[PDB]
Each structure stands twice: as structure tokens, then as C-alpha cells.
Write a protein that binds this ligand. Sequence first.
Ligand SMILES: Nc1ncnc2c1ncn2[C@@H]1O[C@H](COP(=O)(O)OP(=O)(O)O)[C@@H](O)[C@H]1O
Ligand SMILES: Nc1ncnc2c1ncn2[C@@H]1O[C@H](COP(=O)(O)OP(=O)(O)O)[C@@H](O)[C@H]1O
Ligand SMILES: Nc1ncnc2c1ncn2[C@@H]1O[C@H](COP(=O)(O)OP(=O)(O)O)[C@@H](O)[C@H]1O
Ligand SMILES: Nc1ncnc2c1ncn2[C@@H]1O[C@H](COP(=O)(O)OP(=O)(O)O)[C@@H](O)[C@H]1O
Ligand SMILES: [Mg+2]
Ligand SMILES: [Mg+2]
Ligand SMILES: [Mg+2]
Ligand SMILES: [Mg+2]
Lengths: 483, 482, 483, 483
Amino acid sequence: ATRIQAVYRDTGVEAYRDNPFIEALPPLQESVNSAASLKSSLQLTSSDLQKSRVIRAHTICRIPDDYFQPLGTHLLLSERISVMIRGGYVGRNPKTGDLQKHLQNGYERVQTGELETFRFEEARSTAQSLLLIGCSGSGKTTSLHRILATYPQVIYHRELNVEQVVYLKIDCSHNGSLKEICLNFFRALDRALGSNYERRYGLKRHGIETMLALMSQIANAHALGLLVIDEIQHLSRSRSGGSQEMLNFFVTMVNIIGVPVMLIGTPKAREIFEADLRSARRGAGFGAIFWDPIQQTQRGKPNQEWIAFTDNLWQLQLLQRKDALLSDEVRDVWYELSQGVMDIVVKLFVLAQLRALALGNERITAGLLRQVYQDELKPVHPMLEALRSGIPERIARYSDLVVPEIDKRLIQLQLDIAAIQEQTPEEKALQELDTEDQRHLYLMLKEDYDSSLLIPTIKKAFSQNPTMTRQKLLPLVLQWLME
Amino acid sequence: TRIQAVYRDTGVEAYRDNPFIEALPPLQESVNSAASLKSSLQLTSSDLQKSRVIRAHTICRIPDDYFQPLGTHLLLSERISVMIRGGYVGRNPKTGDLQKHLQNGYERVQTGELETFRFEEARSTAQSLLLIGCSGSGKTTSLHRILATYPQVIYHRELNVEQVVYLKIDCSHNGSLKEICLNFFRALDRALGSNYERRYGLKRHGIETMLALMSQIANAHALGLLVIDEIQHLSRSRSGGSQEMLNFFVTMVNIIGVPVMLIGTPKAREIFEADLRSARRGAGFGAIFWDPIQQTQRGKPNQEWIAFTDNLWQLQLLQRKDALLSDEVRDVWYELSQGVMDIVVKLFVLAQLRALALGNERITAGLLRQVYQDELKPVHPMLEALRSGIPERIARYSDLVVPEIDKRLIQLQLDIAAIQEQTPEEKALQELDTEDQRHLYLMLKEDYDSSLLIPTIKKAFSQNPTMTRQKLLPLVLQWLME
Amino acid sequence: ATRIQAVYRDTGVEAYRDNPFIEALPPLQESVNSAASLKSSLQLTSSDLQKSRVIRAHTICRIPDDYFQPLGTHLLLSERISVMIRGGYVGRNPKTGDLQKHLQNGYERVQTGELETFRFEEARSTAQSLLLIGCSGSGKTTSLHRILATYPQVIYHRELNVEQVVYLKIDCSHNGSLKEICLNFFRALDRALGSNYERRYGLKRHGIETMLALMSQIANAHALGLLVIDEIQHLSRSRSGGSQEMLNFFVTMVNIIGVPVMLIGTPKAREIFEADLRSARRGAGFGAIFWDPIQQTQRGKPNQEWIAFTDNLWQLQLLQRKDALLSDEVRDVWYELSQGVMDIVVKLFVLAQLRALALGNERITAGLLRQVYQDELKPVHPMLEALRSGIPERIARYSDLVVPEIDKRLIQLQLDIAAIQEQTPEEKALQELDTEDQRHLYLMLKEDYDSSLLIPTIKKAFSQNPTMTRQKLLPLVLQWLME
Amino acid sequence: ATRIQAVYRDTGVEAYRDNPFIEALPPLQESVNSAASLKSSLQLTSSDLQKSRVIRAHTICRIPDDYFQPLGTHLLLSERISVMIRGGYVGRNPKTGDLQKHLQNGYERVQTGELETFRFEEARSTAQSLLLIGCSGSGKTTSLHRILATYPQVIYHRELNVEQVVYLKIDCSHNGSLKEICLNFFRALDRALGSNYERRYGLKRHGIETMLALMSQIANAHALGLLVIDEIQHLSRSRSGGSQEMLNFFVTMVNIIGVPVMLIGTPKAREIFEADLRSARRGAGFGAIFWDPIQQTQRGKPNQEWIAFTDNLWQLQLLQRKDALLSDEVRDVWYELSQGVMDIVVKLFVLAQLRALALGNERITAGLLRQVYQDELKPVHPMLEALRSGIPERIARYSDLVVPEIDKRLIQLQLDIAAIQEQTPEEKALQELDTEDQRHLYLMLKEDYDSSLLIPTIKKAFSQNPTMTRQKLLPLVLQWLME
Ligand SMILES: Nc1ncnc2c1ncn2[C@@H]1O[C@H](COP(=O)(O)OP(=O)(O)O)[C@@H](O)[C@H]1O
Ligand SMILES: Nc1ncnc2c1ncn2[C@@H]1O[C@H](COP(=O)(O)OP(=O)(O)O)[C@@H](O)[C@H]1O
Ligand SMILES: Nc1ncnc2c1ncn2[C@@H]1O[C@H](COP(=O)(O)OP(=O)(O)O)[C@@H](O)[C@H]1O
Ligand SMILES: Nc1ncnc2c1ncn2[C@@H]1O[C@H](COP(=O)(O)OP(=O)(O)O)[C@@H](O)[C@H]1O
Ligand SMILES: [Mg+2]
Ligand SMILES: [Mg+2]
Ligand SMILES: [Mg+2]
Ligand SMILES: [Mg+2]
């Protein structure tokens, strides 16, 4: 817990003035560019490629979990979360009276006192609930985990005696029930704070009503900012009951708890909320934000976003015979085969390296991509063909495919490439130099100039000029290279 | 929302000692009841200088928080007040000496000194009103804002009743007569804290059994109004025809003592036009009609249109703004929107949302015409029918509405957010287009410093076109070094 | 009842150290020596006899309220209250987190090897509930009220932000149920603390199961020292659940809340709890203290307790022709008349004194006492005869009987007293003598010498005595009267 | 208790090598060193001597609840409990994942002909059982809530999801029904894990066989380690069936359920198991332990255990007039009246101290011991006389006697000690008067003159003059008072 003494700032908005829970948050000015400052990528040096195959394979296997590239939706979602969190605190000011007394005083002052008019609207504050919908693998969880890391989870105050829980995350389990969510709420709260609410409130004897009341009480004890319930797809409609009962429980939970609630799910989870979204009555809530794959055709032009994403990842290939330019057909094949879904796009790039490391030459070709698509990514065929077809019901049915058990498959592929003793000509050429630190110059000089006299002339020149930097001897080698 | 009751007197002699009527906000004149509904956004000059995404969000937040009270809301407010306060006169629970009074009256009529007597005042008048008008005219927001003045639940200390003042129901997209009964309980256990839906809304019950169960509950808490919204959405095939809906809506008024209000589209009146059972019961208190705004009702143009357009125009967030609104712009709005409330606001919002994307940042007639042509496609026949003026064509296309407008707003925001990136770096690489140059830059990015590396090589390429990449390396390296 | 800033003193006991809650309580040593100093009495003056009938009747009317004699059981109950209140704060010291961290730390330290052994004994200190059983009218409620008034109800901590509630009391009503107990807890908490919890939690939606959890959370929030449920005899038996459901509810309430709990009831309510405390299990809790009537005899001798109580009550005689000392016959018949019940002992005396004053033959004797017994105590005959019979089963059935509506009878008898106008010979002499000092002399010398020479001699003597007090005047009149 | 997170420690035995359940338990200890870990005593021995009598009585009443001293027979029981708990976990190893491949490889090799013999799997047969027999009052439960108090009850495993219930304790009922033994298992498992087994299984109408086949399924999901059944005497043909089914139920239970079972009973409960070789084979599966009272001497010289038990308890004496050392006559009388039963030794001490406080004598002699033995220990006399006799049959027939309701006697004695009175000097000065005349004169002349010399003057008036009437005495009394 980043327990920091509450240091209070000045906010431009008059509504957020003198609220001790909002000045404790990081300022907006530094959060303007923090949304776009989420970029993170691996750093590669020249000597990494010259090293042995095991470390190169390890670095290749480290790619999927160490690469992030933000998009426009990562900015829109960041701004939405910031405004939601900062607007959900306006009603819960400890320095001002509660809502019910305000309403009662207004009623007395409009009937007995002097006041021309009043608005008996719910003072519950904004509390804008939201529902995030997207196909599996689009990159929803990995975006929440990166845009919710700016705010510290727990902030401690000293003028009062409270502990502010800025956000809380609940992750569902497969084939769970409604009561499992209630248990997980207390479990996550005890993990975050270090309390013992689970023992005295998370017993299995309690009914749903008692657990909901206790959740409301405890969430109003510690000032809670946001509640995120992830992976709604795993809930089962057999034991829980009808889909109407699930919606009733979700609406009851949202109304009682009194804090902003965000739900993340797939289109298969939309059939539960279909009746709620279409109704236009205020108070139903659950605004919808849809995550979509990167469509290459916008306004009759290739996307600058698509090429920007592909070029950066194309710069991150560890190949001996790699092609610097990404051709139009090479760009098009691994879009038309993967349909732009976020995980499959990087899955091809990480798996084609492994396939090429054993199947022959170290070059990425369309045939190799087709072969890896056909032999490895078997379960995800219906989802990809549904996305290619473009019929919404077909995509809705064939979603949730997550190509199970890729973690063990990566390890098995690593073990498979581990037991290879054949020597490539490139390995022989690299071994012909005894770590003289000159295979780097040889690397820039191998793609065009022939190797008939490349290495002997290089060795002769570096022997003639023993102690200078490689930048100095590169013109020296080039002087007699063509003469 | 549990508000304790505070009693105040009213000048009406018919409501002398009624707690239900005396625990309500006081009676008001014409000016305040119509001027209390006004609401608008407040903007500051600091909002003008901000990032484009926040400005787009503020623009998209306009239709939710803007309301202008016209001259047709005063009548609706007055009628709703009369309906709510007049339906409680026969339901006051203060009956202290009824038994002795009735017994004395009976003992006196038998002897012969008293000719006649009235044992029970059967105050059971069925009051109702139906409000029909074209879609997009604002029958839902104009009702929410009127009803947001009374408290919903009032608690009386002396008694044990919870006076649920009003209740609102919305119909489903296909809909049947059973689901209205199922939604009554589902909204009543949301207004209060209860579990009526599981206890009473079973499947074993028929339509009549739930219709009779609703009466006991609506008389347990002194319900004051019942609003059924969007009767246009009901399907005439899953309900029983065009007659069993009318029978349902006429039997509903008689048994349930509360006043009811029915809201629909002009093509949904064909259900209700068959008989007096809703031409008299439904129009037991009139039938208010909503119409689009007319530009020139008299010889002079209407001041309502001018005031509405001016007040809408004063919420513009653009660097290049024109304070004076041109007459041609007014003509363009009246020609494209034809006075429908839902079209004017969307046209304005979409125009000033596309202005940021195109970068002009000024609203012109051509932009409004283009956004009307591009975005308002499904609602064209309704506009044409309103322009023609034939009642049948107006009735037939009265249910048109543009689908998926919110997704369009989100996509329009995303396009601007993608555009916003200035990209000060990589500008020289944008200037770099030749394949040989890009390969050379990739080769020499680590060796040299790119900032002065990129511009220099373009001159060398421009001077001598008939040179290859391989042979250019020594000369380019020599020029870079010295 | 009013907020008091906490003042931290020092306690000599080692276990009650560094605890904000215990040190803020009143000091232990001062309370020890003042446990038997709660004795109160309605003081009388020598001049009170000389005033009229109405004023003296009004003065006699105040005896049942302005009198309290501390008996043996009062000290034991005081000690039990003290230990129960101050022993339940050991496990809730704010300086240390809780016992779970202690248990985990001990487990880790014994697993590592630095600690030989650890006792997972579930340390809870005393943590014992108490059950009070006694016949109606024994005087439990008054003693409890007078012993709980020493501790201030609410003390405010400024260094912390908690509201210590030292005790809380709940009073039942006729034919009540459990939900009234749950709601009355909140109502009493609002009346004592000064905030509004009834309007937020007193909702008809909640069942009793959820209300108990809310009670537990709120009580743990405020550090509730002690909970006293009173007059459980009044609530109906079969209206709620019968016998098993009420016992189950009481056990659940005792287990969940975690603060000391006391119950007060009649022997007729003991059969609810007979199934629990009779089992030979010292860890089941529910210790019992039995209240018993005062016994005249002890190991063959009259106990000093009853004799001292009767003497102190007889010291307050206010009557015209009353006797001086207490006779053996009247004292012995008083035991058969009242049988030791606290209410009957004082009420018989008050009623007999009032009747003697009203009759005009004011001298309380055995016959007047018996007449009052058979006149006013008709309803409570079965309880008295069952208690005198000594059958342990019949006393339980009639233990709930109580004298109905006696307050109105006192007013009616006072109105009857005000109606009389006849003048007794003592009142005739009172009208004859103007000086109150002379009236006292007449009163003390009334029985030895009759008014044949009494009134004239003292009248002329005090008339001729110009100005002097009684101290030397009385000896001077003695020889003149004797001559 | 409570969900303690597991921390693994290695075990030196080869067979316990890789079992999480065995490793999460507290480390192995030597038998001699483990028996000394059970000792406990009161810490208030000298600091609390000078205080009021009721507080001292309240302190004394807690001697038989917090004083425990191990004997030489506890180390064997501790070793047996440890071996029984840890040795029943070898067949329940959860951490195995290479079974399928190994079994299939063995099958292939034995089918081809490379390998001759193989062993696939074997089921477990029977669980260890133990029997403990001894007379009542010997300490078979106080000495076993402390052996099992050095273990956690519930342990949570992070990598798995099992909650290892280390042990569980249930008691038989007076009815002896076989359906209330399968119904306390669920209740005791619910009172520890906070689960809902009793509603799901017990309340439905199931046969004893079906409900016994469900007790071995929830004792496997939670890796239960030991099951203790107390008061096994109550199945001696008490009710509910015939002897043959009552004997078949235990055999089927031991055969079915996988956990070890321990049985505790009275010397009249070996007739149940001494009926056929199956019952005596299963009751004495891991030895049988028979317990006997303490003897004064074994071979000539007196027992040292008696000396150590009657010397570490005599120190806990809160009396002003105590003796430093034990007179041998007092100890001999104590052994004559106690005969070695654990319960009688403590009670003859606490009751003697309470009577000493009540009567005002602050020292303990043999007379008080004999008086308490004759008065307050009537119901257990046949057992003590049979033990003194020496005939084994009379000892065996009276091994079930127990004294009921001694806590009520303790409370009554505390009340008697509380009600002693203070004898304030003014009341005793008034009590010095021995006639109605002196009291009459004092009451007549109390207010006029000071009471500092009133009593001596009145006493001297009657002392100097033998007797004469009060009316003429009063002029002399006032003359003496004035001068
Ligand atoms: N904007 C992005 N830039 C780079 N990689 C991304 C991006 N979004 C998602 N990914 C990759 O997609 C992979 C899988 O995403 P995942 O968290 O499984 O999405 P979901 O939880 O919706 O299935 C992650 O390993 C992550 O590296
Ligand atoms: N008087 C008004 N002033 C401003 N906006 C209005 C007014 N009346 C309606 N609107 C706009 O019309 C939009 C839709 O109206 P709605 O209530 O949906 O009408 P209907 O229910 O008949 O379709 C609302 O977003 C609201 O902003
Ligand atoms: N020690 C005492 N001295 C004087 N009066 C007493 C004493 N104990 C009880 N009383 C009398 O008992 C009455 C109250 O009895 P109460 O406590 O209500 O009995 P219960 O609790 O059984 O209903 C008071 O009016 C009081 O005068
Ligand atoms: N080793 C011991 N030291 C001191 N007291 C003991 C010891 N063993 C037993 N006792 C006493 O024996 C009393 C009764 O034991 P109990 O649990 O009733 O055994 P059982 O149930 O076999 O009769 C307890 O109060 C306890 O104080
Ligand atoms: Mg996910
Ligand atoms: Mg509408
Ligand atoms: Mg009472
Ligand atoms: Mg026992």
C-alpha cells in the first residue's frame, strides 16, 4: 500500500472544492499526457543477436508480456475512468451533511420556509455505471491493469481516521454463482487493506440480501472509488437461474452499493443486458462502450494506426536474414489471416519465429504464416471466420475462444528447439570469428557484399590498425573492400 | 427517498383536512410552474483553450443537460397537478364517527321524521388523459422534468402509510399485455424496498388475476398517478388483436382507482379510436396534442423559434465563432429539421462535432447540409411527410427513429482522438519517402545521431539520382564525417 | 449522557496497560471503596410532625421512591458489572492490530524454531455472558439502574475518532417480538449517541438475520462496552417462535456481536434456557445468578440484615400516636405478611401509615397491617402463598404476578385524606399552642402526663419565658412541673 | 483455530517426505519436553492479598479452571496422539501428477514381456483406533483439550484450495441414539468452517447407512486428521436398537471413514467392546490406556507425584493467616478424604477457603476439611468408600458417580461471604444499650445535645444509680449533659 499523507492541491472546478478525497488524487495536468505515456517496449542491443540460441529464444519468449502500444481507445477509456472516479466523490463529503438531511431541509424550506421551487432529484451524484463489450483477446484486461496503475490503491488520512480505497478489482471464476462474487469482494478487500472481513462476514450461511447489505455498509465505511468486475462470461445461467434474475441481481447491487461500477464482458454477455440497454429510461444506467478490431478500411484509406502498429512490431524481429522493408503483400497476408484481433496478431509474430527457427531458413514468408495458422491456432478458426464473414450473430455465438493451453505449448516448443544439434551456415560464419566484436560490422556488410574476400580483408585491416573504434576502421575496411 | 410529511394548508375548500393533499408542495401560478423547468450548461472561457477530446465530450454532453420551456408545458403541468391533487379527495383515512352517524341516520329514517339518507359516498370517478404526438417531439423528457418536482415517497408519522405519489412504466419492444402487469411490480419494488415481483408475479396467474392483484397493492399505498409510456411499441400479434388491447386498457381504468395517463404516437391511436371507452374514458380530461414548431404562425415569425435558436446557439465551443446568427442559417435549420425537437439538437451537435474533425472550426450552411445528408438517412420519409402535410403520410411514418446514434457519436469521438496526435518527432521520416533512404536510415540509426543524420542524406540523394545504395555508402559516410 | 473529553489515568494492573478504552474509565480504587456508599434516605426534621395532614401525607407519599438500602447482593452485582465491562476491552486494544496477526506470528515463530511452543487457545479474556433470574418485585431493575449510573455513557476521544459507548440498555414491552429488540437497539443507540441510525437501518425490508450483522458491525465501530437486555419476561412466548427459535436467536446474538451480554428475566422464562445451561459444559457460558427474598432466620438465628433493614425503615416514622420502638410481634408477623419480597415490604408500610393517618386513630398495629394485606394485596395472594409453601415448581408459575395499577390508588387515597375535617385531641392541642418549640415539648411530654395540667403549665411557662431556646428552658420547666 | 496460512517445514522421517498436510503441522518434539509444555498456573499469589473479601472470593473461584499440572501419564498419551494424527496422512497425498504416464509405461512393458510383475494401485484398509478408560473425575477431558490446543484447527493452503481441518471433537448424548451421532458430526463441522452441511445433509430424511456414507465424503474434501468421540459410556444399551446393530455400527464406521478415531469412556463401557474379537481388535488397535487415581506410596516410600501435586496447589492460598509449610497431618487427612481423584482434591481446597472466608478464620486446619467433606460432598460417598475398601468389584460398580450443581453452591457461598456487614461505630454504640429505657432516653435526647458524650453520660447515669424511672431520670440526665 502506497500510504501517503494526504497533501491537498487546488482544483479548477468549483464543485470539487473542499472535498478531502479529491485533492488527495494526482492532479489532472500531469494526467493529461499520462494516458499516452503508457508506451513500453523491450530494449535490444547489437550483441544480443550474436549470442547463443538459448538466450535469443528466451528473449523471443519474453515478447508477449513485455510489449505495449497505446491507441486512441486507451486515451478515451482513461479519460472516462478519470472523470467517473472524480465525479463519484462529490456526494460523499465528510465535511458536509448527508443527502437525506439536505433533501429534508429543502422540503421544509419549500413548504414551511420561503423557497419558490425545488428539484427532488436523486442527489446520488453522477455514479455513472458503464459496460465494456468486446471480443475475447482484444486487450481489455491488460488495458485496465495499465490505466489503473496510476492511482495508488490505498491513501491514508490523518486529520480524520479513514483509509481511502481508490479502486477495487474482482475477478470471476469459471462456472461460478452470484454468491461467489460476494465472497470475492471481501477476499479482495482483505488482500488490499489487510483486514479480516472475510471470516466474520463471508460465511456461506448468509443469504444474498445480508451479503449485499454488508457490502454496502463496508464500502461506505472506507471511501471506495470504483468497482471493477472482470470476466462476466464465466458466469453460468444454469445454477444461478434465468437471465432475468441475473439482471435483477446486478441492478440491485449497483443501486445499493452507491459507488461507480464497471462490468467487462464479451458479446455473449450482452444477451443478459439486452433488455436494459434498449430502454431509454434514466436510472437504468449501463452505458455501453464497444471494443472493435482494427478495420483496415477507414474513409477509403489504409489506417495510419494499423501501419503504425505493424511497423513497430516489425522492428522487433530477431532474424539473421530479416528484410528491413515490410512489403505490401507481407503486410496484407497477416492481416487477412488474423482479422486484426490483438492477441492473434502478436501470436503470429511470436510463433512464426519459433516455426522458422526449426523449419529452415530464417525468413518470414506468407507460406510459413499459413502453415503456423493451420497447424497451431486450431480452436480459434470459428471466431476468425465469423469475423471475416461480418454477420453479428455468427460472431456473437463463436466468441469466447481463447486457444486453450498456450502456456504449456510455448514451453514444449522451447524444449523442441532445445534438442537440435545441426549447424547452419550462418552459425559457421559467426563461429569463424572468435568474439573479436567485429561480427557487428560483418552484419552490416554481409547482406550485399560477398563473403569471398569479406572476412580475410576485415581481419587484415583490423590487424593493421589494432586499437581504434569500429567506426574508424569501417572506412578503412571499405577502402580496400572493392579494390 | 423517504421524506417525512409536513402539513400545510391550501385554499381549496374541497381539500380541507386531507393529509394526502396537505403533505404536497404548495399550489403555484403560471409563471413559476413553467419557468422552474429551465436548465442549461454553463461554459467558461477557459474551456475554449483545452484538448480536443474534452471539448468533444462537452459537445456530446449537450442534449442531456439542455431544456427550454415552451408555451405548451404550462397546460400539461396544470393538468397533471389537477389530476394528482383531485384523486385523493375520496381516499382520506380520517373517519372517526362513521358508525354512530350511520346508526343514528338509520334509526331516524325508520321513524318517519327523515325522508331520505345517503349511507355511502361512492366516490369512484375514473379520471384519465391520453397524450399523443409525433416521435422525437419530447414527450418523455418534458414529463420527467415536470414530475421531478414532487417527492415520490412520503411517510406519515400518525398513520403507517407510504404515499407513493407517482409511478412510471415503460413497455417492451414487442410486448404483450402480461408484461405490463409484470413491469408494474418490477417498478413498484424499485420505488420502495420490497419483493412483490417474486411473491405475486408468478406464471400460474392469468392476466385478470394480476390485474386484480394490482388494485390491492395500489390501494395499500395511496398511489396518486400511473403513467404508461410508449404504447407504440406493443405488438398487435402477441397481444390478441386490435380489440383485446382496448378491452385491457378500459378494464384497467375502472378497477384501479388511481388516475392513469397514456402516451403514444399518432399511428397508435388506431387502437383507441374504436369506441367511447377511450374516447370518453381516455379523454375524460381532454386529449393534448403535440405539434412541431411553426416558423410563421402569424404574419410575423414566431418568437418561440427565434428564442429557442438563439439560446441553443449560445452554447458553442469553437475558436472561430460568429456571435450574430445569420438568417440563412435559420432558413437552413427550418428547411432541414422542420421543427422537430430531436432533429435540431442532433443536427447542431453533429455539425459542431464534425467541425473539429475537418479543422474548419466554423459552422456553415454547407456543413449542416452535408451532415444532414450523411447522418440522418433513416428519418427522411418522416421529414418529407411533415413537409407535404397529408395526415395519412404523417401517421404512417410517425414511428421512424435513427438507430445506433450513440455508437456513431462514440466513433466520431474516436476519430478526433486519433487525429489529435501532433507527432512532432518522426516529421523528417515523414519527409523521407524513398526506399533506399529508409534502408540507409535504418542501417545508420545506431551509428550516427538521427537529428542531423536525416536531413543531410536527402541532399546527397537529390544531387545524383543515378546512384545505387551500395556505392553511395562511402560518399555519404565521408560527407557525414566531414 | 453527554459527550465528555477523555482523560487518561494510570491503572495498577498490568493487563490493562496502554489501552485507551480502559484508562478513560473512572479509576478503579475510588469505585472500590464507594460500592456500598449508594445508600440514600429521605431525611426528616423534628418540625415535620407539627404541620397539617395534607403536607405530611404528601411527604409520606414520597417514601417508595426516595429510599434505597444496599443489601448483600448489590455488592456482588457491582463487582460482576465492573469485571464484565473492564474485561471485554483486552482484545480490542487499538495499539495492537488484532489476535489473528498474533496467531500467525506465533505460528511462524514456532515453525522457524525460535519459539518452543504456542497455545492456539483462542484468547478471548473473560468474554462471558450473564443471566439474571429472580422473582418479580425483588428489585433487580432499580439496583441495576443505580449501579450503571456511575459510568458515563459516552466519552469522546480526540486523538482517535471513535465514540466509546460504555454501556447500552434495552427495555422490552408487552407481547413483543425479536424485531422490536433489533429496532430498539438502534433507537437507544440514537437516543444516547445523538445521531440518526433508525432512519437509515430501521427498514422493514431487512430480516432479523441481516439486522444482527448490522448490529455487530455498528457495535464494533463504536466499541460498545456492554449490552443489557432487560425484562425479557414481558415479550410473548409463542408469538415469535415458541421456545426453540427464541433460544437459537439468543445464542446467535451472543455469538455474533462479541461484546458482553446480560439478560434479566423471571423463573417462568428459565425453561427457555433450561436446555442449555443444565448441560455439564463450562465453556457454554450463560452463568446464572439467582435473586432470592430476604430470609428472617439464618442458621437458627435472626440475621442482622433483616433486623437492620426493618430498624432503618422504622426510623422514618411520621405519626401522631405512634409507638417508639419496634415490637417483636409486629416484626414477626411482617415476615408472614410480606415473605421478604422487596415491593411488599415497603408498600405495606406506606399503605398502613397512610390509612392510620386518614382514619383519625393513628397508631399502626398488627390488625391494621392485616387489614391492609387483605384489602389491597388481593391479586398477589397466589405468589405469596406459593412462596410460603416452599414448592419450587408452583413458585415458577405464579412468579409473573404483580400488583396492577397502584399509582392511581395512592392519588385516590390522598384525595380521600384531604376530604377529612374531624379534629383529633392532639390536633386540638396543636391549634391551642402557637409556638412550634412548645409543640415539640408537648409532643415529647404527651404520654407521661395527661393534659389535666400539661397544657396549662407549659402554656403559662412558655408565655412568661421572654426569649430563650429549649436547651436550658426544658430543665427549668421540669421542677416547676414537678412542684 | 481460524484459517492460518500454511508455512512448510521439513520432517526428518523418510516416509513423511513430500506431504503438504504433514509438513504444515507444528514440528516434532521430544516426549519428555512436550509433557512439560502443558503446565499452567495462576500468577496472582502475593500481590492480591490485601483487598476486599468479595474480590478475593471471585479470584479463588477460578482455581479449578486455570490450574493444570502434568503427570507421568501425559507423555504417553501425547506421543500416541501425535503419531495417530501424522500417520494417517500418508495415503492422502495430494501432490502427484505423473501417475498416468508411469502406469501406462509399466503396463506396456509388462504386456510386451520386458517386465514380469507390476503393481498399479492399492486401496487403504482400516484406520488406527485407540481407547482411554478411567473413572469419572480423573481428568479425561481437561487433559485432552490441552494436548490438542497446541495444534491449529483449520489451516488454509495457498497453492491448493483445501482447508485442512486438523481435528474435530463431538460428544455422545444421554439417549445414546445412533442417528444423533451422525448428526453431531455435521454440527461440529459447521461450527468450525462456517458452512451449511447440516441443512444440506442432516435435515433431509436419510438412512443411517446413507448418512454414514456421506460422513466419509466431506471428511475427504477437507483433509480431516482425527475424530474424538467422548462419553462413549452412554451407548451401553441406553436406547435405539439392539446390541448387535449397536456393535455393527462402530465396526462399519471404522471400516468406512478414513480418519483415525479415538474413544473415551467409563470403566462400565468396556463391557460393550469385550463381546467379540472384532470389537476388541478394533478398540485396542493401537493399544488401550487405563487410568488410575494417585496413590500415596508405591513401594514403602511415599509417591513424589502426590507431594508435587499437593505442594504446587497449596501455594495458591489468598488468606492473611497462612502457614509456610504443610503439616504432615493435614496432607494425610487430605489424602484420606480425597483418595486421589483429581476433582475432589481441588474442591476440598476451594470450598475450605471459601468457608474460611465466610466464618472469619483465615487459616486451614483438618477440622474444616472434615466438615466440608461431611457436609457438601454427600453424593460421592459410595465411590470414596469403595475406593478406600480395596475390593475391585465395588470400585468398578461405583465408577460413574458425579456430584451435580456445585456452581450454585459456589455462588451461594460467595453471597454469604459478601453479606457480612461492617459494624459502623455509631450503630455498635447504639447497640451497647441493653434495654428499652436507655434507647427511649437516647432517642428523646439525641438531637438536642451532641452524641460525642451522650452515650458515656447515659451509661454512667445507669451505672452509678442502680435503677429508677426514666421520667425522673431525665432531669438528672439533662443536668449532667449541661454541666
Ligand atoms: N494496445 C496493445 N499493444 C500491444 N499489445 C497488446 C495491446 N492490447 C493487448 N495486447 C496484447 O494482447 C494480449 C492478450 O490480451 P488479453 O489481456 O488476453 O485480453 P482479454 O483479457 O480481453 O482476452 C496481451 O498479452 C497483450 O500483450
Ligand atoms: N423543450 C426542449 N428543449 C430542449 N431539448 C428538448 C426539448 N424537448 C425535447 N428535447 C430533446 O429531445 C430529445 C429526445 O426527446 P424524447 O424525450 O426522446 O422524445 P420522445 O420521448 O417523444 O421520443 C432529448 O434528448 C431532448 O434533449
Ligand atoms: N434496597 C432497596 N431499598 C429500598 N427500596 C428498594 C430496594 N430494592 C428494591 N426496592 C424497591 O423496589 C421497587 C422497584 O422494584 P423493581 O426493581 O422494579 O423490581 P423488578 O426488577 O423485579 O421489577 C422500587 O420502588 C424500590 O423502592
Ligand atoms: N493434571 C491436573 N492438574 C490439576 N487439575 C486437574 C488435572 N487433571 C484434571 N484436573 C481437574 O479435574 C477437574 C475435572 O476434570 P474433568 O474434565 O471433569 O474430567 P472427567 O470429564 O474425566 O471427569 C477439572 O476441573 C480439573 O481442574
Ligand atoms: Mg480478459
Ligand atoms: Mg419517447
Ligand atoms: Mg423491573
Ligand atoms: Mg468429561
